Design a protein around this motif. Structure first.
Motif, PDB file in Angstrom:
ATOM      1  N   UNK A 302      11.785 -19.898 -42.059  1.00 52.06           N
ATOM      2  CA  UNK A 302      12.643 -21.066 -41.829  1.00 52.06           C
ATOM      3  C   UNK A 302      13.274 -21.013 -40.435  1.00 52.06           C
ATOM      4  N   UNK A 303      13.649 -19.812 -40.024  1.00 55.01           N
ATOM      5  CA  UNK A 303      14.290 -19.604 -38.711  1.00 55.01           C
ATOM      6  C   UNK A 303      13.921 -18.247 -38.109  1.00 55.01           C
ATOM      7  N   UNK A 305      15.216 -15.842 -34.696  1.00 55.52           N
ATOM      8  CA  UNK A 305      16.133 -15.629 -33.576  1.00 55.52           C
ATOM      9  C   UNK A 305      15.717 -14.402 -32.773  1.00 55.52           C
ATOM     10  N   UNK A 306      15.478 -14.625 -31.498  1.00 52.71           N
ATOM     11  CA  UNK A 306      15.130 -13.536 -30.578  1.00 52.71           C
ATOM     12  C   UNK A 306      16.381 -13.192 -29.776  1.00 52.71           C
ATOM     13  N   UNK A 307      16.973 -12.063 -30.122  1.00 50.04           N
ATOM     14  CA  UNK A 307      18.233 -11.624 -29.501  1.00 50.04           C
ATOM     15  C   UNK A 307      18.036 -10.496 -28.484  1.00 50.04           C
ATOM     16  N   UNK A 308      16.797 -10.130 -28.249  1.00 44.62           N
ATOM     17  CA  UNK A 308      16.478  -9.081 -27.263  1.00 44.62           C
ATOM     18  C   UNK A 308      16.485  -7.688 -27.903  1.00 44.62           C
ATOM     19  N   UNK A 309      17.653  -7.264 -28.343  1.00 46.53           N
ATOM     20  CA  UNK A 309      17.807  -5.941 -28.963  1.00 46.53           C
ATOM     21  C   UNK A 309      17.181  -5.931 -30.367  1.00 46.53           C
ATOM     22  N   UNK A 327      16.108  -8.605 -40.812  1.00 40.00           N
ATOM     23  CA  UNK A 327      16.577  -8.056 -39.528  1.00 40.00           C
ATOM     24  C   UNK A 327      15.764  -6.817 -39.149  1.00 40.00           C
ATOM     25  N   UNK A 329      14.155  -4.458 -35.405  1.00 44.51           N
ATOM     26  CA  UNK A 329      14.380  -4.172 -33.985  1.00 44.51           C
ATOM     27  C   UNK A 329      13.191  -4.565 -33.118  1.00 44.51           C
ATOM     28  N   UNK A 330      13.576  -4.837 -31.892  1.00 42.98           N
ATOM     29  CA  UNK A 330      12.691  -5.283 -30.826  1.00 42.98           C
ATOM     30  C   UNK A 330      12.263  -6.727 -31.100  1.00 42.98           C
ATOM     31  N   UNK A 331      10.969  -6.963 -30.997  1.00 40.69           N
ATOM     32  CA  UNK A 331      10.412  -8.329 -31.071  1.00 40.69           C
ATOM     33  C   UNK A 331      10.075  -8.851 -32.493  1.00 40.69           C
ATOM     34  N   UNK A 336       7.932 -20.398 -37.100  1.00 40.38           N
ATOM     35  CA  UNK A 336       8.479 -21.128 -38.248  1.00 40.38           C
ATOM     36  C   UNK A 336       7.315 -21.693 -39.054  1.00 40.38           C
TER      37      UNK A 336
END
Lengths: 367, 367
Positions: A302-303, A305-309, A327, A329-331, A336
């Motif tokens: 559904x969603x 999010x790429x936050x970098x860390x 959740x 780590x990394x990529x 979607x």
């Protein structure tokens, strides 16, 4: 500091439900909980700025109710007591020690000692009008530190968690702790602030104590649903399950998805009863990459999010109302609408009864 | 939307330094930057609430300067336009479509369409006095949506960031995007909000554009020091280094610690010059458990944070002024005062020159 069945009420309205606490010397305690849970009233009661209707307040080892707030040995940082303009940082800090009758000797000696821990020595003889916001805050702390209290008390900064002035406060607080090592009590509504500064945390809800303990204890062993979802963000996932079996300290539940898979959890088991409807909790960080067989949950993305860390995925599992939050780590490159699968580790799962109380975890962990 | 050398000045004071942007259709763009960088003035310029002193503003494909703000096809959301009391949600939303000369037909047809996307159909004929804050915010959005703009423009919510009302806004913003797919432009000072909602981000600093790109592009490849430390938190570590060599697209630097170790970095190398003083950046998440040989940094533990999902260590390395900040997952049990060692991976390092410009990174990160 020790609290014993301390209660506070107006007529019949109860704002503080017989609170039991035991604060060992040197401990940095922080009261956390939603708005209006009673964290500030509780603090003010310890300070002596509000009366205790019934119960015992021990500070040091002796009852402090009935004792004038000044002679209790506690020191509250009065965040709104405006500095006396036309007075030096030193005169302001020592002001209170004047009417009391102190001698210039103790005054200009306790003022030089607090002036070090708070880094104000080079600003002592300065007018407030010439001080920045960040250092005016420190003068306040210095004000309560020259009275040489044995229990330092600070309430919620009217700032706003990202507000620069509150970041300062937060750093000064921890710095001050790792310096004087004295007993401190801080209040906040922000769960992260708590997990960061506390030695011991007391979660408050509707005027009662939900739970007390070290940050890691609240994290791995929440006593109930409330605490389970109050610490950690993004929030813990909750899936509906039914009890299908029971061994000694185990409990097997059935998962909601089709093919209703059964899984055993190393959980309390005390009193559960086969057929009961319970709530299974699993934190987004503790879900696995699905590469590992065992229990697998699958849905549509559904969603993303790429936050970098790290990367946060929101999956919608068929036969569950709320999106499951993942959740890693990394990529982890996903689009979607795509179907994504994740693993469910029984050792990291929590089980909650109808009353929302947790049927204790039997696994082991780092703290 | 396209901007071309757009500048804004009062006399000689320049608040917007010739800005170049190219916003493709359907993109969700967010302007980020510290307080007073000019992110709001820039938005207001696109809206037509502020004049453009020089430069070209293209919307759709045609110059929009000189064109009345209402006939530009852009729709701003007025967070301070108080609802007309004594009027229904429908009357407030359609209000502006009245003086314009709309027919009840289009009015009561565009009001039912926006009423869906914003979930207000069941509140349409209601007085504002009976609406909650969360839904009043939505009426404002519905207000600007019935004029059926082609570019949606929203400015910073005067909330805070943890303020429940702003969390709603944020959720509504993304929901609305994944629904109409129309071009949107949001403004915030919070780096996290940006990395979370954006399709493209434009970092602003002192009125200029620091950089523009996808969130992952800003994170792995900051163009300069400013951007390098604006995205991501806790912040990137910066260590002072000296250039000792140069190959083709690889620069060798010398680390500050004793035994001054030399390391090669897969960086630009264009113009560096042996002997130059530069800045080496390494994010906390990218440091390693030291188990891995190569370059090793060591010091004394100053702080330890147990957050459950991860652990944050603050180490003080001898021959660096600021504490190095480490970040790892799950526990890592360490005590303050103890000595701790971590690895430094050349492939994840950044190199900044004296001007702060990022001369670098050949290493490809999947994104």
């Amino acid at each position: 500091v020790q609290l014993q069945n301390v209660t506070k009420a107006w007529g019949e309205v109860v704002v503080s439900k017989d609170i039991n606490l035991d604060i060992h010397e040197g401990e940095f305690v922080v009261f956390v909980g939603p708005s209006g849970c009673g964290k500030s009233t509780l603090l003010r009661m310890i300070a002596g700025l509000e009366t205790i209707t019934s119960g015992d307040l021990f500070i040091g080892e002796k009852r402090m109710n009935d004792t004038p707030p000044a002679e209790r040995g506690v020191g509250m940082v009065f965040q709104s007591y405006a500095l006396y303009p036309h007075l030096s940082v030193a005169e302001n800090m020592s002001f209170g020690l004047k009417l009391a009758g102190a001698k210039k000797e103790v005054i200009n000696q306790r003022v030089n000692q607090v002036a070090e821990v708070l880094q104000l020595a080079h600003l002592l003889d300065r007018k407030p009008k010439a001080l920045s916001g960040g250092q005016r805050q420190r003068v306040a702390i210095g004000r309560t530190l020259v009275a040489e209290p044995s229990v330092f008390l600070l309430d919620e900064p009217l700032s706003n968690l990202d507000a620069a002035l509150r970041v300062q406060m937060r750093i000064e607080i921890s710095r001050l702790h790792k310096r004087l090592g004295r007993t401190m009590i801080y209040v906040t509504h922000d769960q992260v602030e708590a997990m960061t500064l506390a030695d011991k945390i007391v979660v408050l809800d509707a005027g009662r104590v939900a739970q007390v303990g070290k940050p890691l204890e609240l994290y791995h062993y929440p006593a109930d649903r409330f605490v389970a979802g109050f610490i950690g963000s993004p929030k813990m996932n909750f899936l509906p399950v039914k009890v299908t079996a029971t061994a000694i300290d185990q409990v097997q539940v059935e998962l909601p998805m089709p093919n209703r898979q059964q899984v055993w959890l190393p959980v309390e088991s005390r009193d559960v009863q086969v057929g009961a409807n319970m709530s299974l909790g699993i934190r987004p960080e503790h879900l696995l990459p699905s590469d590992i067989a065992d229990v697998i949950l699958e849905g549509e993305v559904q969603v993303v999010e790429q936050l970098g860390n790290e990367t946060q995925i929101h999956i919608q599992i068929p036969s569950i109302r709320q999106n499951l939050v993942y959740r890693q780590n990394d990529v982890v490159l996903v689009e979607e609408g795509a179907t994504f699968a994740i693993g469910l580790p029984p050792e990291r799962c929590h089980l909650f009864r109808e009353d929302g109380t947790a049927c204790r975890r039997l696994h082991k962990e780092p703290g």
